[PDB]
């Protein structure tokens, strides 16, 4: 009859076929992940190949309907998603070369290891021992050696591969209508066709910069504080006004500053909020933890778990010959199947991780009624923030006292709040400059403003400029420092975390205001309130049908990111930091270098 109905019928057929194929693929993947055998690998590969081929032919067939004859604004999104995520434009040889490059990069990163000098018998791996050495060892020379050895051994090999990879990716992006591959990533936030909610690709960068300009003071104050504390640890090496050495950030790359809590605790005399001993005394287990999380989620009015979830999910390490990965994940296999995989110990960290995963599961369960191509978060940051706010609200002394793990005689004052705020800041605030710098450098190199012969130079310049971190050993163009990171080598976007860090606090402030809570924001609980749960569920049920700007306006009454909630959250620590930094210089000079 007409183009719109001809497209609707095709979408109706695709919706039913894709669900079955995706369920088969997900079941194969789960069976392999919980149980590592060769036959499971073969089944997973077969299912993945079938799914990829089917998506390929469906995307090829989808080209028959031009996009300028449709005004329904919902069929158009499905067709656009199909065309975007199933199309191939490069030649077969170029596709094979790209696949080989990606597989080589992944294998090199996964199998990378460093051998001890004058001891070839033992060679250290990254995950087992290198991370532990970076986190715990207090030796300057040992940390410097490990850092330099890893950088040299995983950067020198991957540099030409990365050059060829970026050339091929730019060629593929220019084959499409996008300007370059960075534009291809930035297009995830693009919104068109709706009046009052349009969002262009070029806007995002500006927004990011603006937000950074509003967050520079707090961070730098924290930086100064940490520097002083580190000066108390290593007196000779650290300059009073210089940038921090890179290998003393508590990890391999400096992504998180959590490992520095022991050295830089404000008040070590005050007891810490720990519930491991209480849980051991009360004889807790994984089932009790998950039941408590389910009860907390019920208390706000949201629906709770199904029988299949309890029957099928695994919550303990099988042990014996049964080997499985213990990275916690939330699985949405489709057709009303939800599972959680996690090797659980009786610790507070697992107590929070259970809430974090159940938040993701609830968000997945919310939008089950939407069509197949729209069952997703508004963008790549909404899901992370939704998962994180639940763990944000479940680690307060009031919640623990209500549960009963914490003693009723416990009381809060200056020092407890200050310690908690500093502990949170060492994890949340620290990673923002690192993420922003990495994404900015990657966008610049994709654009082509930085020639290859200057690459590392420019990179290190930015390390001295934004993050205020100086390299311990000078590096020429032979090294490839950024490729050492997992996300960089495995072709993953690195801007979702920055948006999540703001969305979570905006959501938390809105929910706390809806609950009519009074007092500091960092002490807020929404356990018994139902209005906050109702508003959250109203947002969650939308799926991908509405633009993310409309959902954000529906929740918090705003159309863009804002850093004000984060500053409101961290103000009590900010005042104390300003009071303490009176006798310490604030800021760093890039001219200072550890190697003279």
């Amino acid at each position: 009859s007409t183009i719109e109905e001809q497209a609707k019928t095709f979408l109706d057929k695709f919706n039913h076929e894709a669900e079955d194929l995706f369920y088969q693929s997900s079941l194969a993947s789960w069976n392999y992940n919980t149980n590592i055998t060769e036959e499971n690998v073969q089944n997973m590969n077969n299912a993945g190949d079938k799914w990829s081929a089917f998506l390929k032919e469906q995307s090829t067939l989808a080209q028959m309907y031009p996009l300028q004859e449709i005004q329904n604004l919902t069929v158009k999104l499905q067709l656009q998603a199909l065309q975007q995520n199933g199309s191939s434009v490069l030649s077969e040889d170029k596709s094979k070369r790209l696949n080989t490059i990606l597989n080589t990069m992944s294998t090199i990163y996964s199998t990378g290891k460093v051998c001890n000098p004058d001891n070839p018998q033992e060679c250290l791996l990254l995950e087992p021992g290198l991370n532990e050495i970076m986190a715990n060892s207090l030796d300057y020379n040992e940390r410097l050696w490990a850092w330099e050895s890893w950088r040299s051994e995983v950067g020198k090999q991957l540099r030409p591969l990365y050059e060829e990879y970026v050339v091929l990716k730019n060629e593929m992006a220019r084959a499409n209508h996008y300007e370059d591959y960075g534009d291809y990533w930035r297009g995830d936030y693009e919104v068109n066709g709706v009046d009052g909610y349009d969002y262009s690709r070029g806007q995002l960068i500006e927004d990011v910069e603006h937000t950074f300009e509003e967050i520079k003071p707090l961070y730098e104050h924290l930086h100064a504080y940490v520097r002083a504390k580190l000066m108390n640890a290593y007196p000779s090496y650290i300059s009073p006004i210089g940038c921090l050495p890179a290998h003393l950030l508590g990890d391999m790359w400096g992504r998180f500053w959590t490992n520095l809590y022991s050295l830089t605790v404000p008040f070590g005399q005050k007891p810490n909020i720990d519930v491991t001993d209480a849980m051991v005394d009360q004889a807790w287990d994984a089932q009790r933890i998950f039941k408590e999380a389910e009860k907390f989620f019920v208390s706000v009015g949201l629906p709770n778990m199904t029988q299949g979830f309890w029957e099928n999910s695994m919550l303990t390490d099988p042990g014996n010959v049964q080997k499985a990965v213990c990275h916690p994940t939330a699985w949405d296999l489709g057709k009303g199947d939800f599972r959680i995989l996690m090797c659980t110990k009786v610790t507070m960290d697992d107590f929070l991780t259970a809430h974090h995963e159940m938040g993701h599961i609830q968000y997945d369960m919310a939008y089950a009624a939407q069509p197949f191509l729209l069952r997703n978060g508004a963008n790549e940051g909404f899901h992370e923030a939704v998962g994180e706010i639940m763990s944000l609200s479940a680690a307060t002394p009031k919640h623990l006292k209500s549960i009963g793990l914490l003693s009723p005689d416990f009381q809060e004052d200056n020092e407890t709040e200050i310690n908690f705020l500093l502990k949170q800041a060492l994890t949340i605030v620290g990673t923002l400059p690192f993420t922003y710098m990495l994404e900015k450098w990657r966008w610049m190199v994709f654009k082509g403003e930085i020639p290859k012969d200057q690459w590392m130079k420019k990179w290190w310049e930015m390390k001295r400029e934004i993050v205020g971190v100086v390299e311990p050993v000078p590096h020429d163009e032979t090294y490839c420092d950024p490729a050492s990171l997992f996300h960089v080598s495995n072709d993953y976007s690195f801007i979702r975390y920055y948006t999540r860090t703001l969305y979570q606090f905006q959501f938390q402030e809105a929910l706390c205001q809806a609950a009519k809570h009074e007092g500091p924001l960092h002490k807020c609980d929404i356990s018994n309130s139902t209005e906050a749960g109702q508003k959250l569920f109203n947002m969650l049920r939308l799926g991908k049908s509405e633009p993310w700007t409309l959902a954000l306006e529906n929740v918090v009454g705003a159309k863009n990111m804002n850093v004000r909630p984060l500053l409101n959250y961290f103000e009590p620590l900010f005042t104390w930091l300003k009071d303490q930094n009176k006798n310490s210089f604030v800021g760093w000079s890039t001219d200072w270098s550890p190697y003279a």
Partner: protein
Amino acid sequence: VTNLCPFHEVFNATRFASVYAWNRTRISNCVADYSVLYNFAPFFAFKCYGVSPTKLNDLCFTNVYADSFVIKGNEVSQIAPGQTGNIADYNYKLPDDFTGCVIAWNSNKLDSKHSGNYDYWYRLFRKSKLKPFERDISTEIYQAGNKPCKGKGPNCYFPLQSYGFRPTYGVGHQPYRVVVLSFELLHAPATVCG
């Protein structure tokens, strides 16, 4: 009490029929007892429209029709008068003045396979809606475009789409067995009650 109406054959029949080709049975000239229905597992839905369930043994009829098929768990609400939906207007339509009872119970244990049960189909496309108590078995290539089909391909689809059942599916997608009873009057001796 001499002759008992067969209700142990409509229920408890190992394998039922596809919804698009549902099965029909005629029950007459026997004493019908409705207490045998309550001897089964608890029902997902037990709705009687024209008559009260308790007073089924005080009034009686001339013919009783039993219709049985298998559908999803969330399509049970579509088996009712005045309902709109895919399975309601393309496979089985009920009149607005329908008088009868609708029975539906879970059958996951008997109609599920680990590999997948691909022995149930339903109609996905049709040119026009279905009249009440009408069936369609012909399988011709449905045309959705101006160009004639002359074979399966673009814009031309096979009308029937198959289910797939696995025991690990959640409730709302697992199979449900549905039995629909009908009663009517006509100018003839009733002879069906007791």
